Design a protein around this ligand. Sequence first.
Ligand SMILES: Cc1nnn(C)c1-c1cc2c(cc1F)c1ncc(C(C)(C)O)cc1n2[C@H](c1ccccc1)C1CCOCC1
Length: 126
Amino acid sequence: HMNPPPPETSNPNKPKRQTNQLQYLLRVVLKTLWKHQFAWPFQQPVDAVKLNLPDYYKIIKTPMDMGTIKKRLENNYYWNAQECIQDFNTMFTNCYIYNKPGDDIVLMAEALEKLFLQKINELPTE
Ligand SMILES: Cc1nnn(C)c1-c1cc2c(cc1F)c1ncc(C(C)(C)O)cc1n2[C@H](c1ccccc1)C1CCOCC1
């Protein structure tokens, strides 16, 4: 009946780092997916109140969205690229869990996922 609070995007207790991999994840990976026509349902946490789905946050215990990823990268929340990649993986996995193959949202996630995995193969060295 209420939306849970969004995931943290900032932590003063969390050590900050700016690596070539992390600048690539913001400037190339995030930027590509953020401007894609299918990005919009993934750009903010699932507003399960507006959308009238109070079962969303009962099935999905680890929510993630691109808005949260974008802020985390801008806030140097991540120490390594692998924590950011795991958040992208969580965002897509959540969509596949709640929904089922052939659903338009699932097809939109797959197109974004395809484009993400292509960009991650091209990740620079440390
Ligand atoms: C991600 C994600 N992962 N799982 N889900 C359920 C979503 C998700 C799905 C969303 C929206 C937001 C979401 F975060 C959303 N926002 C607004 C509207 C309008 C404007 C219409 O009112 C429709 C929306 N939905 C739609 C849908 C609603 C309910 C069940 C499934 C899908 C989809 C939006 C694309 O086109 C396909 C349907």
